[PDB]
Design a protein around this ligand. Structure first.
Ligand SMILES: Nc1ccn([C@H]2C[C@H](O)[C@@H](COP(=O)(O)OP(=O)(O)OP(=O)(O)O)O2)c(=O)n1
Ligand SMILES: Nc1ccn([C@H]2C[C@H](O)[C@@H](COP(=O)(O)OP(=O)(O)OP(=O)(O)O)O2)c(=O)n1
Ligand SMILES: Nc1ccn([C@H]2C[C@H](O)[C@@H](COP(=O)(O)OP(=O)(O)OP(=O)(O)O)O2)c(=O)n1
Ligand SMILES: Nc1ccn([C@H]2C[C@H](O)[C@@H](COP(=O)(O)OP(=O)(O)OP(=O)(O)O)O2)c(=O)n1
Ligand SMILES: [Mg+2]
Ligand SMILES: [Mg+2]
Ligand SMILES: [Mg+2]
Ligand SMILES: [Mg+2]
Lengths: 481, 480, 479, 484
């Protein structure tokens, strides 16, 4: 076994250590070739054909770049080849838990199919990783390259999911190596190599000329002591670039990841999966059969759960799958559920997850006072609530970043928002509410618009942008508008 | 129905006429979302995740750009809006006939599964197009936008497949130039290549050196031997030689990558072993096989890269052998590359002889001590034709040019008027040999047979010949 | 006939023969010798680009937008004459720039000729007039169907604004034509679109804003009895992003602290050279660097070349100017001390800029200092950052249309878009530098600077606790 | 003090060792900010505003990348930090000798102004480098970072210009044979495959608006040092041979499209003409206040330091009546009243035009007797004849015959690969000449006449038929059966 070189369009030629190659050449990893990074986004942005596989390689590569850069500039950190390989492996493997169409699966499908369960792709990644290691005899190979499976497997899982009270909650590495936990999935502030890869890769595919300059950030990164931990610190000068990184993230969510049509296509696919869930069988361990919604309980079954489910349903002839198949066929003909509009709660108002189901009922209960041919019911409405933030709810992630200055490179400091600019956001979280109608004819749509705008007025939400055009009889009643 | 705008990473924001949108939003077109452009290339170049769908949009767009440019600069050509839409439709629809993993399907699988049949993706595209039109009531919609379905459907098909004396019925000789946009049968210079150069390069991580926007700006129609043809400005001749050089480079680096090809071969093998057991429902509920779905477009509509995963995730014992080959791909236990050579002789190895080659390699008698003896079935011999798109012919001899001082007068430019640094030949064959036995001793043996076979046949010395077979290469003084 | 030019940003661009005639003049070719980013090239070595190529791009984009509107809306009656006039204004709006672009009118002219009110825009109109008259362009304009009297006026108005409906070059039904090249209402114009893409390409920063997308969605609608360009409603987020990008590019590149100090040092050299450099203008009359703006024939010859003429001079009179430039070549630059901002209400006025080095030197930091610094040792640079319209939100001055009613213009407020947007649209940055570069001077400069920030109630410099640990504790507001 | 980071649009953020920063921050290096990489090319490709300065940084960076990669993969080579810095410095400093408008200066101007002298930008770079070091007290700073100035300065100069003595045997003194591979990085005298090309391919393409086909990062990953005929040399992986042929194809493409663009060349020619007419009157101050001319500034590095593209503007903005003729030529460039391109041809078969004959060519063109009615008669002085040598960097030789390869199964064993083992679609020849003819008389009747003379001359000499020959000279081309 020797190093392989791979040509990636984002990073160029990258070198992979043979242990990494061994982990990649498994069914559990190769699975990620059949899961679209952006899920239903490909149905809106035709360049977004990329899958989780190539993203994972990039994350693994960038994780290696950063840990090598720190070790070269600061030999006193005693970063070992063992540390480098463990960080790269965590980087490679943090996307292993994604399901069909990525965020569709755990953001929409699982919550509806298994409301009792608490599932995230991160937990899935840890379980899949364990299954990958055990199923393929990787532990001996790890030992052969100087890794200590007991500690290092724990370290890898902690890097992905966080600690499995205390000053130091981690067991895989001690406080003097704290900075290693900030590379792959940064729980403190969200600044990690996962974002850096997807910014560049998603932009390249989407046709958007945006990214964060990660090479710059790597050149200016240092490890300093912060409250008895050794942490990664950014050069003070870079603070503006970090605010820009979160702005870019939010832009990409607005333009692409939460595109109103990309979301409704995800919703339609989720609907098809719900109607197919009783009939599709996935074989897991010992020949046991699982459903789409229960394959998450057996990694051997989950290994075989990919975007392929979409086509299996679409190409089925079984009459049982007729309803699921019809929804997918509507997607192919582009007969989609119709977007009605968008609004936001005002100021500090927030809607909660428990209430999401009551919203279609509220919209249908509005009493516009316009002449309507058709009356709509709760089941005709879809109400999608989207949380937009800087990765930490209402918190400013830059308040959780440590910096150093050129005159004192070993001394960590904090920089507040007011020390940077007044042109920055005054809030770091908000909600968008999108309403769609499942009845697509002209009269239903007209009615849906009247209900929607009336509902906005009753709730004191913001005036939809086209409110005066879509509901000219409703908007005058609200003088605030 | 109004115009839609779509954001493509290669071309930016593209406008699509509502008739094109109607054609795109069908099962027959959306199918192309599930067919990788480069087939097994994705298993070597991880950026090559692109499908035929987005390439097709780009071809349709570029076809529109060129026909509009010609009309704007030369109103006397009388290009109509109807002509523009017909050219765009042919551009959109020329990839409709591709099968699972694109060139794998018609280059490898069909020739082995149905040796008696003569199938190309082009023929498939015309059949798929007909089925798309009829199944979705597109003819009325065509009429609504000023098209004449009888003549225009014929024109569209002719643009894709050629003629079904002026041999075309969809347009007359004064619109000859319209047949050169989408699939140029005369010299291969068409908008299909322009899109894939730029798109494949973007995804592969290689830089494209052909500038189609430049070419469009300098393109004119001129009279050539009583046809109106597209002519390039004389200055551009160098750039055209470069276009074919780029195509050849892309084939060498990516499309004929030795591992990408062997993955395609392994997938083909899995399909052959699955062909008796996979069922695809076509018209009237009739069942077809992977190899017969080409006979029914309703079945072919459902034949995509999904077949790979249906096999890989199957539990049926009948599919065990097919499933095992695909599992070898996932663990990267691939058939092993042995080497590459070329004929020195000017006769091309013929397609009819391809099957006899593994036998010849196994019949070589290398004078070397060997632990293991290999059989014909252990060898794969892949013959690859590399050319400038027209066998031995120089495609630039079939291009017409014009000069700045006389923009309507077509001229010819010969190779000697351009450069002495150009190719003296325009076609060649590469022969790759692989071994299905992957252990160290089998591979060592395979190398000895291979080099011996090269020597016996008077093929070129493999590049690593002296390293892989030091006992064999001395016997050939032509190599020393 | 038409010429084709290969531009790295826009690809192959077609130029109408009238445009080619305007380009092939000394007044336009001059722009080949003026760096777009001035002193920015001394920090970003990719930023070698000049005003010339930017001007070609602006002219091209202006043509793209006006063609797109005419094709989608024939009822606007956009003529070939209108298209050429818009392209010419686009080509010629950078004609008035001086040596190192914004250095010249942002730093040098204000200091050299404080009484005068000069902008590159005014310079562009004067240069344009001189270009036309000196080269016999009026007849050529007539030959392509232009009407010089009206159209020259239209071109100038597009660049500088009005020289009721205040414009004479075109009537209210063609109002939308005045929004293409230099948009006085909200700053959304093709000049920005070119520089975003060109500057990013050269600087090594990824250039946001998709102007092709914007062009596809642009329409003309009636707004308060004018025909104006309206954006599709869904594009409002992209417009906020466009201004965010602009502000980023200023923060990272155009107001780079070292780029700015190099501009300051070059300005200083020009001031010390101003009495001795002679530039021949009309009728053989001699001008100075600071007075060449009064004669276009002299101004034609005033480019980045002045830098090298000073640097390579042997005249003892130019010794002081030459020494400053030589310090730039050895990279013995004035040293950056830090940055701060005013707090709460406070805004620093232009009239007070000169008093600021005095104030910094007057601070009494309670720390032991080896050296005492004087006002002349400090440079204080005040930078106004905004979204192009002072305290105003430029998106409040944009008109939108919806898909369901394409001819009905609407307004969209900030609250209808996002709560993650800026609450303010203007601010000031204050950078302090020290002309004394040794270790002890620098240490002292830092103590003064932080003390001054404290006394004035400015924001705590980012590295305040590190550079002045004895000073920052005294301020509870800072912790 | 410490490393600086610089943002380059081609390579991204590059780290520079403090010694390199010291060399860069001198008048001798900063001079390269005022010299256009592509000379008169900017007057055709408006994106080509880049200067030699930023190219030099990129060459220095790539030289570092390659030497670091070799050292990391093969510790047994004993590459030291000292070796790395010396290679980077040679990379940074190999463009120091360029004059105004780069190749215009040493390709056109110097050969005409000082025909006796043998001047190349390479020689200029060595002299400039010596002057840079001595004028700025760099030797002590070198010592401070572990360099040994005597041997290392020699090594740096040898990397740029080749052996400084006649050895007639290992001809280099800066490093021994076991470090021979270090001499292949910056300026590869054996086959021309070096980091200088890699930077300019990527940079020129970025600025010109053309896409580059050569991947240097790939090449660096596959490069190894192996023993070849008792030297340690850089070897490429066997399967990279196709990419190397492509690299030379790309170089030839870039020359055809851009560097030898017919108008870019005539602008260079016009600027050269202006410089020749200005050469008696422009003064450049050198060492001790002595005055030099444009053509003699090459003899004093202090003067040469101040000789940049600025000369163009000094002439253009001059008022001295003595500079009137020079100034008028430059003004013609501004108004785009350029000498007119007449056409292009090539010698046939074996014919090779010699440098000594270049001056006789305008006479030959004017001596042609086209059998056509002409209103104007043209003289030798009305014609410019530009002869351009196009090749793969080594005259008639295939540079890939001078490359060593290794195979995956035996990484330490160097091998040769011949053209026939690669492809039949490759060039059969590796050198050729283009002949461009221009007319200084730009009116319609002169141009018509020039075309008739030119095509007649092609016919008389048996050169190739110009591409538009039948269009520009329909009465002349029929007389040549070889063309019909
Ligand atoms: N001219 C080429 C050849 C390959 N690649 C890409 C495809 C892969 O992502 C990566 C590695 O492919 P190689 O062909 O270099 O490697 P192999 O593994 O096929 O060759 P070997 O195992 O002989 O080294 O480089 C490329 O960009 N350009
Ligand atoms: N801010 C955006 C939004 C979308 N897109 C891309 C995705 C699509 O490929 C194309 C068109 O999407 P739009 O959202 O503009 O169009 P819709 O059809 O979704 O909206 P509508 O029908 O309301 O015009 O542009 C983009 O690049 N940037
Ligand atoms: N092979 C080429 C040649 C030129 N260009 C660029 C350089 C110019 O910016 C633009 C136009 O150059 P041309 O050589 O096409 O134009 P000329 O004016 O030299 O040719 P002519 O006057 O013969 O049309 O295109 C290019 O990209 N590729
Ligand atoms: N936000 C920024 C700032 C700078 N640069 C570029 C400009 C320079 O080419 C290089 C170095 O600039 P810095 O501002 O990082 O370096 P300084 O020397 O100005 O800062 P200091 O000396 O304080 O570290 O990076 C950049 O791309 N983005
Ligand atoms: Mg391999
Ligand atoms: Mg839509
Ligand atoms: Mg021309
Ligand atoms: Mg600095």
């Amino acid at each position: 076994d020797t190093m392989k070189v791979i040509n990636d369009p984002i990073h160029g030629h990258i070198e992979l250590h043979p242990l990494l190659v061994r982990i990649i050449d498994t069914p559990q990893f190769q699975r990620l070739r059949y899961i679209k990074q952006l899920g239903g986004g490909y149905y809106v942005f035709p360049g977004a054909s990329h899958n989780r596989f190539e993203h994972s390689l990039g994350v693994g590569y960038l994780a290696g770049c950063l840990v090598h850069a720190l070790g070269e500039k600061q030999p006193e950190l005693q970063i070992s080849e063992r540390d480098v390989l463990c960080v790269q492996i965590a980087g490679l493997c943090r996307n292993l838990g994604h399901g069909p169409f990525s965020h569709m699966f755990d953001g929409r499908f699982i919550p509806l199919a298994r409301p009792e369960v608490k599932w995230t792709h991160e937990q899935g990644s840890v379980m899949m990783f364990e299954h990958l290691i055990n199923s393929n005899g990787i532990k001996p190979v790890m030992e052969q390259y100087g890794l200590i499976p007991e500690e290092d497997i724990c370290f890898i899982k902690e890097q992905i999911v966080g600690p499995l009270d205390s000053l130091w909650p981690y067991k895989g590495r001690p406080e003097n190596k704290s900075f290693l936990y900030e590379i792959v999935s940064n729980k403190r502030n969200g600044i990690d190599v996962d974002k850096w890869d997807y910014f560049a890769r998603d932009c390249h595919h989407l046709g958007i000329q945006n990214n964060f300059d990660y090479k710059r950030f790597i050149k200016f990164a240092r490890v300093c002591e912060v409250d008895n931990e050794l942490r990664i610190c950014a050069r003070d000068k870079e603070v503006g670039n970090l605010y820009d990184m979160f702005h870019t993230r939010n832009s990409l969510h607005r333009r692409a990841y939460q595109h109103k049509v990309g979301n409704i296509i995800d919703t339609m696919i989720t609907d098809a999966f719900l109607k197919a869930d009783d009939y599709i069988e996935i074989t897991g361990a010992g020949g046991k059969k699982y459903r789409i919604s229960t394959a998450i309980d057996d990694m051997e079954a989950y290994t075989k759960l990919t975007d392929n489910i979409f086509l299996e349903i679409l190409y089925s002839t079984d009459p049982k799958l007729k309803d699921a198949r019809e929804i997918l066929k509507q997607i192919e003909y582009r007969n989609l559920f119709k977007y009605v509009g968008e609004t936001q709660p005002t100021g500090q108002i927030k809607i909660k997850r428990e209430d999401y189901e009551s919203l279609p009922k509220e919209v249908a209960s509005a009493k516009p006072k316009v002449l309507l041919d058709v009356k709509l019911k709760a089941e005709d409405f879809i109400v999608d609530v989207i949380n937009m933030d800087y990765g930490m709810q209402e918190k400013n992630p830059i308040d959780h970043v440590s910096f150093y200055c050129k005159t004192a490179p070993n001394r960590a400091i904090r920089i507040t928002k007011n020390q940077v600019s007044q042109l920055l956001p005054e809030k770091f979280a908000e909600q968008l509410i999108r309403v769609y109608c499942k009845k697509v004819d002209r009269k239903s749509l007209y009615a849906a618009r009247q209900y929607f705008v009336q509902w906005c007025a009753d709730r004191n939400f913001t005036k939809p942008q086209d409110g005066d055009v879509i509901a000219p009889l409703i908007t005058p009643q609200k003088k605030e508008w």
